[PDB]
A paper describes a structure:
Here we report the biochemical and structural characterization of this M-ADH enzyme, which we refer to as BkTauF. We demonstrate that it is a novel sulfoacetaldehyde reductase, which differs from BwSarD in active site residues and metabolic function. BkTauF catalyzed both sulfoacetaldehyde reduction and isethionate oxidation, as measured using a continuous spectrophotometric assay monitoring the decrease/increase in absorbance at 340 nm due to consumption/production of NAD(P)H. The optimal reaction pH for sulfoacetaldehyde reduction was 7.5, while that for isethionate oxidation was 10.0. Each monomer consists of an N-terminal domain (α1–α5 and β1–β9; residues 1–178) with Rossmann fold, and a C-terminal helical domain (α6-α14; residues 179–375), similar to other structurally characterized M-ADH enzymes.
Crystal structures of BkTauF, both in the apo form and in complex with the NAD+ cofactor, were solved at 1.9 and 3.0 Å resolution, respectively. The apo and NAD+-bound structures are nearly identical, with RMSD of 0.37 Å over 375 Cα atoms. The asymmetric unit contains four monomers. The quaternary prediction server PISA suggests that BkTauF forms a dimer, consistent with its oligomeric state in solution determined by gel filtration chromatography. Out of the four monomers in the asymmetric unit, only one contains the catalytic Zn(II) ion, coordinated to Asp192, Gln196, His261 and His275. Catalytic activity of BkTauF was abolished by chelation with EDTA, and recovered up to 85% by addition of Zn2+ and 15% by addition of Fe2+, suggesting that the physiological metal cofactor for BkTauF is Zn2+. Furthermore, the putative isethionate-binding site adjacent to the catalytic Zn2+ is very open, which precluded molecular docking. The present crystal structure could represent an ‘open’ conformation, and further conformational changes could occur subsequent to isethionate binding to form an enclosed active site resembling that of other M-ADH enzymes like FucO.
Author numbering:
A (entry chain A), B (entry chain C): 0 to 375
The structure:
Amino acid sequence: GMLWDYAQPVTIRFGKGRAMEIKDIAEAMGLHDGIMVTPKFFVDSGEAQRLIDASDGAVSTVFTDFSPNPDVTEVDACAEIIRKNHCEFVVAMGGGSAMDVSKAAASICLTDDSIADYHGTGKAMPQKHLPIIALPTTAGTGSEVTCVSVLTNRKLGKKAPIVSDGFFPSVAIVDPELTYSVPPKITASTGMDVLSQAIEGFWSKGHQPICDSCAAHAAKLVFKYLPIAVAEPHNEEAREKMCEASVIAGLAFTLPKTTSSHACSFPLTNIHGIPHGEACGLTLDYFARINKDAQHGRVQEFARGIGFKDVDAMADAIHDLKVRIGMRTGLKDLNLTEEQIADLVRISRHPNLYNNPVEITDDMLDTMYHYLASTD
Amino acid sequence: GMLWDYAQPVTIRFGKGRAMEIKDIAEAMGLHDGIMVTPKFFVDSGEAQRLIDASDGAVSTVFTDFSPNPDVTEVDACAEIIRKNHCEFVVAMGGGSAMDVSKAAASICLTDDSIADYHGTGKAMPQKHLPIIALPTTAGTGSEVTCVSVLTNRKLGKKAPIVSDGFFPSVAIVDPELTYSVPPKITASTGMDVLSQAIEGFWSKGHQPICDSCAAHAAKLVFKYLPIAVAEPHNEEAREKMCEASVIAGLAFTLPKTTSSHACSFPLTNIHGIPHGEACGLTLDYFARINKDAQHGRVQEFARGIGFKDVDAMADAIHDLKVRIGMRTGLKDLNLTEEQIADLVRISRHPNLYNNPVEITDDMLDTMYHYLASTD
Ligand SMILES: [Zn+2]
Ligand SMILES: [Zn+2]
């Protein structure tokens, strides 16, 4: 007998060109003077102004002063801009960073505190917030359907997530046109993020059947369309299918949580500069073979459902995909020392590691990292 | 270019025994003095009082005075009980009827109007409502995750649905134990409702990928577990799997809407007394063979995905399933006249018929109903 809780409060508006529907949402909610939180890139490309003009006054303010890893100071500056301009809703347009700034700011602007007071301090967030409209511009982190904001405190050397039900966007507009300009290398890494979220969401010990269905759907799309999107950045079908996979994989992993590849990805990114998606993909087929017979055949059933003979064939396809799109298959070029490998082993023991269906021991991590350290 | 809107506002608590969590939900919402809307069967069996006593005073009122086809007068009576008792939330425990009554009563109780003023009159419902906790006792109509209430006005001779965003339950508790007492003939019919909802939701012109994923998951479960649930009413695994299929098929059909089998089911139930799920099942394999090659092979991919060689093998299995569980394969025993057959043809032209991926003409309906009229 299974027990699970399923809650997915975000409304998804999917479709090419639908980023122009910000006005519709604001009008339906009776809100004015929105603030758009977006990286400077979309100001320079005229995308921001295009969407601002389309809002016919619904959005009045733009905030771009945040970093790819957002800081609590940038959230606090964003919240003060909200107060000064009396903003009633937040349009988060960008990758994970813009969305995580927006979730935090939309809550804290209603108070006179700093976001740091709730950053890892164990203190629960206030729950009243400005409505958030999230417009992902990559495919993707899936952040547009999560209630998590990952921030850093640079002055305090701390990086922790903040979880609050008030962080769920009200509407996610998933518009594939906003991804057409993502460069091939970033398309590849963000695509591997989707595939990792889907596969790990399915085989997590916290698996539940609705997320299972989303995971299989998204994974199948990535194998077919990710090579097309990397090789043909203006192939509209492949971009649309990657955006479909991205948002649905977001629905797949949010509740079951991720597992071994995500646990290992954090030191690969933070210490060695490997982008998140590529870092997840580095271990994805390795752990797939470890997990092949887990849960009385569930993963084999998954592999067959998305079109492979078995898990080993899916693992081969993961490797082949990585090679085709230029994602790391090894770490030999890092010339890792034994001390560095021991650091990877130690820091990879993250709570997510325990969601893997097979126990991943320290000796297994040591074996994996020595394997990667001697593989191109 | 795919366009779709996805919204699923219901929180689902799935699990054997979790109907005891009513008080935990009322606590979290800060609500008291709930009313339980449930058929007399559950009062007589002791199950209602078992759950009310478990709620530690959360539920103070019981309402059973409604019909298997609920009337506007019974909704109004429920709303008056709510007002008299200052009830703050509604617990709908039963099949489609109890959930239909509960949704409409929870909105209309905040007005001094009859629900009849909003029943097929073009007048939209007021949107404020008491929160609804839905506890389905069959697997199922899926009503615990829809915003639709189907009511009849016996004095006016009208049977029509009311659609309102305020009708969405706040929480759906899907506790398979509540289905253990469903007799085999009703288990069979409600199970065919699940299968039709899943298959029609998938091939509907309004199809969208999250609903597609849910549909395939639910349909696969029905083929395996519905014969077991019918043959073994206290097989806990089969009852749990049918509940999983039921709530997930509810997610599959709510947004894309149902199609030809549901359109035809309405006169089959309203004129000839055939229960809803059985009435949908009567035409499901028939329309499958008409629809098999629509949408450039989508339905064939669906059939293969859930394990059939093709749609015709799936339709064969739908037929074999109906025979095994005692569901109607024909209408010969009704000795239908040519006028009655024409009535079926005419009345089956419901708005949902145009959701079918292949145009269903009057000639095609005439052929189908003459076939059914000549088949055991
Ligand atoms: Zn990730
Ligand atoms: Zn139905």
